[PDB]
Design a protein around this ligand. Sequence first.
Ligand SMILES: C[C@H]1O[C@H](O[C@H]2[C@H](O)[C@@H](O)[C@@H](O[C@@H]3C(CO)=C[C@H](N[C@H]4[C@H](O)[C@@H](O)[C@@H](O[C@H]5[C@H](O)[C@@H](O)[C@@H](O)O[C@@H]5CO)O[C@@H]4C)[C@H](O)[C@H]3O)O[C@@H]2CO)[C@H](O)[C@@H](O)[C@@H]1N
Ligand SMILES: [Ca+2]
Ligand SMILES: [Cl-]
Length: 496
Amino acid sequence: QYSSNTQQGRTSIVHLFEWRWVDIALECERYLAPKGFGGVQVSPPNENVAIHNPFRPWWERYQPVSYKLCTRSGNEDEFRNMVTRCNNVGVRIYVDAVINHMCGNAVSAGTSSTCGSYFNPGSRDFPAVPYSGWDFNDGKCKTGSGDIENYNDATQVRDCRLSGLLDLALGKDYVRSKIAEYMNHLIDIGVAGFRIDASKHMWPGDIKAILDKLHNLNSNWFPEGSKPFIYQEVIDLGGEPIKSSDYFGNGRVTEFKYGAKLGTVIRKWNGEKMSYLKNWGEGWGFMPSDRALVFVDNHDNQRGHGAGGASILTFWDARLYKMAVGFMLAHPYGFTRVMSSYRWPRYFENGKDVNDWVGPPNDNGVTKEVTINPDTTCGNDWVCEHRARQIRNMVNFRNVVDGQPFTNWYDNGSNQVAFGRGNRGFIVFNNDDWTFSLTLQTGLPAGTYCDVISGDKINGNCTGIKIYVSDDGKAHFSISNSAEDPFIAIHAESKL
Ligand SMILES: C[C@H]1O[C@H](O[C@H]2[C@H](O)[C@@H](O)[C@@H](O[C@@H]3C(CO)=C[C@H](N[C@H]4[C@H](O)[C@@H](O)[C@@H](O[C@H]5[C@H](O)[C@@H](O)[C@@H](O)O[C@@H]5CO)O[C@@H]4C)[C@H](O)[C@H]3O)O[C@@H]2CO)[C@H](O)[C@@H](O)[C@@H]1N
Ligand SMILES: [Ca+2]
Ligand SMILES: [Cl-]
């Protein structure tokens, strides 16, 4: 469950949050395959409640009504088409699995669902599964409200309703079997693994029991005996009884400490500075590298949901965000996930974004297609971080340097730092209020390299900055503090 199952020489996943299946399929073929992306995390593909107050929020997708593959992203046919087309170009699909719960207990009964299935939350009736009152934790939960009231109590965290979401009785074989049926449908279609949503809210042993029922990966694309990649969403920032380590038996785990700390460093808040990144990774108290799923922001915390945090960097803070993503993609710690977002009308009132609920770009609830502008950016309010040259070229940097050790670290005791990855790549950052101008040991063979942050290598020349590495591995770097992108990266495949 720890192996990504990506094509050899591909090392990242991109979250195409709320994208439609037909758009992901095209993106696999036209962009992700040729640019060396490993795979795509997709939004939950199962049927959810259609929530009309507020208007079609992104979070309606975290309120299941059934396991039919029928959502605003598309139907089962389009989902199958996408997984096939992506695998056929060597790009994997990872599904956001919403398995802890069904919908909110106060949602009105009827057919307000993305495939029109009937459901009745008040009577615990979900006949399109089917589930009944016997399949939820109402009798098991010991809180007065029936909801989770206290994260200091590990038992209620697992057995009670997260924010009122109907909590499935994952201790029962019947329920485990219905979930496994859903996951095996996805595996057989060709999915390479799963983000297990709300993992903290399930017993590690119930997750195990479900995983035990799963098929091996589809034997047309994956070697015989291949198991789905599992990464579990557990928010563990310390101070609670439940630990990220409790879930290592099942797969990798999201390391939320990573983006919180990195955002603080890059913002130069709380006395932090880039020179302190010398021991980044387990040195900062993070989980083992071979279990961490890392990221700068995710779909929750980029809009203040989840653990939130003021330090989180997002596309809204573009200059600092690209730097943070660049550092993440250069550094060997963890398995890297890149966020790809849409714009929404952020509006702060009393410190909170009152529009943190807004769903994807839409026409009366119908998700907009991803349009491609002439300069390869996206239209229709999709941000497409993964198409920014500075981020896309760093995704390739990570591929090029895969397996190479962290070496040749330099820092100025403040915010000018640099490091290499064996003899295959080198990166330099200036986050101080003055120019970074210095000759550094790069560890690279002698030659002329294209900086892949400012430009690209094409037909024997560079479109941006060129770096000249001499016979002894040394090169001069000059980065103004007023640079729009104050970092430079060179690698084996950017050499002229
Ligand atoms: C009925 C209910 O509906 C709406 O809730 C929505 C949330 O507002 C959205 O954020 C979203 O939730 C997703 C989800 C549920 O499927 C789980 C994910 N993330 C969770 C995480 O798993 C939880 O553990 C919890 O995090 C807490 C930490 O565990 C604590 O240590 C501490 O930090 O506090 C946090 C925050 O409480 O919440 C996270 C968001 C997943 O990634 C989410 O996207 O979708 C739900 C369902 O629609 C309404 O907003 C709410 O008002 C209603 N009561
Ligand atoms: Ca639970
Ligand atoms: Cl996540």
